[PDB]
Design an enzyme around this catalytic site. Structure first.
Site, PDB file in Angstrom:
ATOM      1  N   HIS A  14      30.847  34.482  19.654  1.00 21.71           N
ATOM      2  CA  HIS A  14      30.743  35.121  18.366  1.00 21.71           C
ATOM      3  C   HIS A  14      31.115  36.537  18.528  1.00 21.71           C
ATOM      4  O   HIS A  14      30.482  37.270  18.842  1.00 21.71           O
ATOM      5  CB  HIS A  14      29.688  34.827  17.685  1.00 21.71           C
ATOM      6  CG  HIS A  14      29.536  35.380  16.213  1.00 21.71           C
ATOM      7  ND1 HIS A  14      29.912  34.496  15.069  1.00 21.71           N
ATOM      8  CD2 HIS A  14      29.554  36.598  15.592  1.00 21.71           C
ATOM      9  CE1 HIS A  14      29.670  35.159  13.780  1.00 21.71           C
ATOM     10  NE2 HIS A  14      29.641  36.612  14.327  1.00 21.71           N
ATOM     11  N   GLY A  15      32.287  36.842  18.035  1.00 23.17           N
ATOM     12  CA  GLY A  15      32.908  38.088  17.930  1.00 23.17           C
ATOM     13  C   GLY A  15      32.796  38.773  16.441  1.00 23.17           C
ATOM     14  O   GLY A  15      32.812  38.225  15.422  1.00 23.17           O
ATOM     15  N   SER A  16      32.285  40.007  16.578  1.00 24.18           N
ATOM     16  CA  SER A  16      32.199  40.757  15.556  1.00 24.18           C
ATOM     17  C   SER A  16      32.534  42.174  15.416  1.00 24.18           C
ATOM     18  O   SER A  16      32.712  42.746  16.535  1.00 24.18           O
ATOM     19  CB  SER A  16      30.809  40.712  14.979  1.00 24.18           C
ATOM     20  OG  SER A  16      30.504  40.852  13.548  1.00 24.18           O
ATOM     21  N   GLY A  56      22.824  45.098  12.319  1.00 24.54           N
ATOM     22  CA  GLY A  56      22.173  44.048  11.728  1.00 24.54           C
ATOM     23  C   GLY A  56      22.044  42.643  12.472  1.00 24.54           C
ATOM     24  O   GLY A  56      21.080  41.819  12.271  1.00 24.54           O
ATOM     25  N   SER A  99      37.233  34.389  19.347  1.00 25.80           N
ATOM     26  CA  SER A  99      36.153  35.346  19.004  1.00 25.80           C
ATOM     27  C   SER A  99      36.415  36.764  19.189  1.00 25.80           C
ATOM     28  O   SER A  99      36.061  37.586  18.378  1.00 25.80           O
ATOM     29  CB  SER A  99      34.983  34.914  19.513  1.00 25.80           C
ATOM     30  OG  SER A  99      34.558  33.627  19.147  1.00 25.80           O
ATOM     31  N   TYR A 143      38.022  38.525  16.325  1.00 27.52           N
ATOM     32  CA  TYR A 143      37.112  38.978  15.247  1.00 27.52           C
ATOM     33  C   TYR A 143      36.486  40.303  15.431  1.00 27.52           C
ATOM     34  O   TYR A 143      35.477  40.828  14.695  1.00 27.52           O
ATOM     35  CB  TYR A 143      36.224  37.813  14.688  1.00 27.52           C
ATOM     36  CG  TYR A 143      37.117  36.637  14.172  1.00 27.52           C
ATOM     37  CD1 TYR A 143      37.578  36.893  12.936  1.00 27.52           C
ATOM     38  CD2 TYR A 143      37.300  35.614  14.899  1.00 27.52           C
ATOM     39  CE1 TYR A 143      38.412  35.783  12.397  1.00 27.52           C
ATOM     40  CE2 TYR A 143      38.153  34.488  14.529  1.00 27.52           C
ATOM     41  CZ  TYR A 143      38.561  34.753  13.065  1.00 27.52           C
ATOM     42  OH  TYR A 143      39.197  33.786  12.697  1.00 27.52           O
ATOM     43  N   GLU A 193      36.673  25.429  16.540  1.00 31.55           N
ATOM     44  CA  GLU A 193      35.992  26.368  15.783  1.00 31.55           C
ATOM     45  C   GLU A 193      34.516  25.486  15.477  1.00 31.55           C
ATOM     46  O   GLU A 193      34.755  24.212  15.226  1.00 31.55           O
ATOM     47  CB  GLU A 193      36.528  26.626  14.375  1.00 31.55           C
ATOM     48  CG  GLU A 193      37.218  28.002  14.493  1.00 31.55           C
ATOM     49  CD  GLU A 193      37.731  28.380  13.246  1.00 31.55           C
ATOM     50  OE1 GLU A 193      36.981  28.227  12.141  1.00 31.55           O
ATOM     51  OE2 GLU A 193      38.946  28.678  13.058  1.00 31.55           O
TER      52      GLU A 193
HETATM   53  C1  LIG Z   1      36.209  31.208  15.422  1.00 31.85           C
HETATM   54  C2  LIG Z   1      35.046  32.282  15.898  1.00 31.85           C
HETATM   55  C3  LIG Z   1      34.665  33.406  14.897  1.00 31.85           C
HETATM   56  C4  LIG Z   1      34.817  33.329  13.784  1.00 31.85           C
HETATM   57  N1  LIG Z   1      34.757  34.613  12.776  1.00 31.85           N
HETATM   58  C5  LIG Z   1      35.180  34.367  11.226  1.00 31.85           C
HETATM   59  C6  LIG Z   1      34.512  33.953  10.486  1.00 31.85           C
HETATM   60  C7  LIG Z   1      34.669  33.022   9.279  1.00 31.85           C
HETATM   61  C8  LIG Z   1      33.985  32.748   8.546  1.00 31.85           C
HETATM   62  C9  LIG Z   1      32.499  32.804   8.327  1.00 31.85           C
HETATM   63  F1  LIG Z   1      31.562  32.160   7.556  1.00 31.85           F
HETATM   64  C10 LIG Z   1      31.907  33.357   9.514  1.00 31.85           C
HETATM   65  C11 LIG Z   1      30.533  33.729   9.986  1.00 31.85           C
HETATM   66  O1  LIG Z   1      30.073  33.212  10.764  1.00 31.85           O
HETATM   67  N2  LIG Z   1      29.611  34.674   8.995  1.00 31.85           N
HETATM   68  C12 LIG Z   1      30.585  35.208   7.767  1.00 31.85           C
HETATM   69  C13 LIG Z   1      30.148  36.693   8.015  1.00 31.85           C
HETATM   70  N3  LIG Z   1      28.649  36.880   7.943  1.00 31.85           N
HETATM   71  C14 LIG Z   1      28.010  36.676   6.416  1.00 31.85           C
HETATM   72  C15 LIG Z   1      26.611  36.842   6.628  1.00 31.85           C
HETATM   73  C16 LIG Z   1      27.848  36.462   9.060  1.00 31.85           C
HETATM   74  C17 LIG Z   1      27.880  37.028  10.496  1.00 31.85           C
HETATM   75  C18 LIG Z   1      26.790  36.903  11.041  1.00 31.85           C
HETATM   76  O2  LIG Z   1      25.707  37.721  10.546  1.00 31.85           O
HETATM   77  C19 LIG Z   1      28.254  34.882   9.155  1.00 31.85           C
HETATM   78  C20 LIG Z   1      32.809  34.111  10.576  1.00 31.85           C
HETATM   79  C21 LIG Z   1      33.990  35.494  13.243  1.00 31.85           C
HETATM   80  O3  LIG Z   1      33.712  36.529  12.610  1.00 31.85           O
HETATM   81  N4  LIG Z   1      33.812  35.611  14.654  1.00 31.85           N
HETATM   82  C22 LIG Z   1      34.028  34.454  15.585  1.00 31.85           C
HETATM   83  O4  LIG Z   1      33.757  34.706  16.744  1.00 31.85           O
END
Ligand SMILES: CCc1cn(Cc2ccc(F)c(C(=O)N3CCN(CC)[C@H](CCO)C3)c2)c(=O)[nH]c1=O
Length: 352
Positions: free
Chosen positions: A203-205, A212, A245, A248, A329
């Site tokens: 999980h990339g962020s 958080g 990931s 992201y 995914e």
């Molecule tokens: C494919 C791997 C990958 C995808 N994506 C894009 C993505 C798209 C839709 C999503 F719903 C989320 C996601 O999981 N979310 C949305 C944001 N936040 C909202 C509270 C959260 C974060 C944790 O608190 C939960 C992420 C990343 O960003 N990283 C990754 O490794």
């Protein structure tokens, strides 16, 4: 002022995570007017209200309502969250693409508010290192993994084998591998410990989101958020390709250091999908969604680390014909199904 005794890599991780200036650059990235709306004025309820407008746009698009309300809602969005586009026209909010773009931004704004609130809350002690105070705010045990162990060998091999040729803009170098243990998360994950099909996934962020992410764990988009802003609904998204990931992280040339997670994800029964499906609930008996990618990590090379499968195989064709996803995914819709194990500091070497 007792200077911190934490390991230097952990101290650097703390400084990088709580950097207020990085939070400001991320807001400037989105062309947000920091003069009209400084970081201190960013509010939780403000963000949820902005989520509501996105949802109002989503419903207006879905019933034909009228595109002029959508114009008014779009203008209302830019009034709630003050932007600064200089001379250009602010992007309109009339189609699904723009709703996804603003939902993503609000996702980052939500975690940025959580980080800042963490910093300016609790207690402060002059005799304490700020690095020590900020470390305790994370409510997480962070230990540096020994470079020569088998954990790091497996993790490095995971990074080395699953960088897709498509993501050719950069290559990745592992700087630090951290073993992380959020308080309470092990108890929360126990009801899913012996579910089948548990994989170790990326999980990339953005770096700013990790204060958080470590204090509250990975969360689901709030109820105000529009379900059509996310390809597979409001869940937590993982990948088996490290480069998918790492994209992201939104790493740039000016900030080439990124943070990526290795989490144990209880996938169970996998609802296999090839295109978008903005679901809120899963069909009874299914525990996750798998987006079928054209390329998949070769299943012949899978290994087990602590009874968890690690798909570190190289990229091969998946045999899936009509799919819209280049790579796999994995999505879960209950936060208890995720147990965070490792946090990686990655250096992005952009090719030019
Ligand atoms: C494919 C791997 C990958 C995808 N994506 C894009 C993505 C798209 C839709 C999503 F719903 C989320 C996601 O999981 N979310 C949305 C944001 N936040 C909202 C509270 C959260 C974060 C944790 O608190 C939960 C992420 C990343 O960003 N990283 C990754 O490794």
């Amino acid at each position: 002022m007792t200077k911190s005794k934490l390991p230097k890599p952990v101290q650097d991780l703390i400084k990088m995570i709580f950097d207020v200036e990085s939070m400001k650059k991320a807001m400037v990235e989105y062309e947000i007017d920091l003069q009209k709306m400084p970081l201190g004025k960013l509010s939780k309820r403000q963000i949820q209200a902005a989520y509501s407008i996105l949802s109002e746009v989503q419903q207006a698009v879905s019933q034909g309502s009228s595109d002029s309300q959508i114009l008014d809602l779009s203008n209302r969005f830019y009034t709630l969250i003050p932007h600064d586009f200089g001379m250009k026209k602010p992007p309109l909010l009339n189609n699904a693409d723009s709703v996804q773009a603003k939902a993503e931004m609000l996702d980052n704004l939500l975690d940025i508010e959580v980080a800042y609130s963490l910093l300016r809350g609790g207690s402060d002690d002059s005799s304490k290192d700020p690095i020590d105070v900020n470390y305790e705010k994370l409510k997480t045990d962070i230990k540096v993994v020994d470079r020569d162990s088998e954990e790091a060998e497996i993790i490095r091999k995971y990074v080395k084998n699953t960088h897709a040729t498509t993501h050719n803009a950069y290559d990745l170098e592992v700087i630090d591998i951290f073993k992380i243990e959020r308080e309470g998360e092990c108890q929360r994950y126990k009801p899913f410990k012996q579910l089948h099909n548990r994989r170790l996934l990326w999980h990339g962020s953005r770096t700013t989101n990790f204060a958080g992410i470590l204090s509250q764990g990975l969360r689901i988009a709030p109820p105000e958020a529009p379900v059509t802003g996310y390809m597979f609904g409001k869940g937590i998204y993982f990948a088996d390709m490290v480069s998918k990931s790492a994209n992201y992280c939104h790493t740039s040339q000016g900030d080439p250091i990124g943070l990526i997670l290795l989490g144990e994800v209880a996938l169970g029964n996998m609802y296999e999908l090839k295109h978008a499906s903005h679901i809120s609930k899963l069909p009874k008996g299914k525990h996750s969604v798998k987006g079928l990618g054209k390329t998949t990590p070769d299943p012949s090379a899978n290994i087990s680390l602590d009874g968890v499968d690690v798909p570190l195989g190289t990229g091969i064709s998946s045999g899936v014909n009509d799919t819209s996803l280049l790579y796999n995914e994995y999505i879960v819709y209950d936060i208890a199904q995720v147990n965070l194990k490792y946090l990686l500091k990655l250096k992005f070497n952009f090719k030019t």
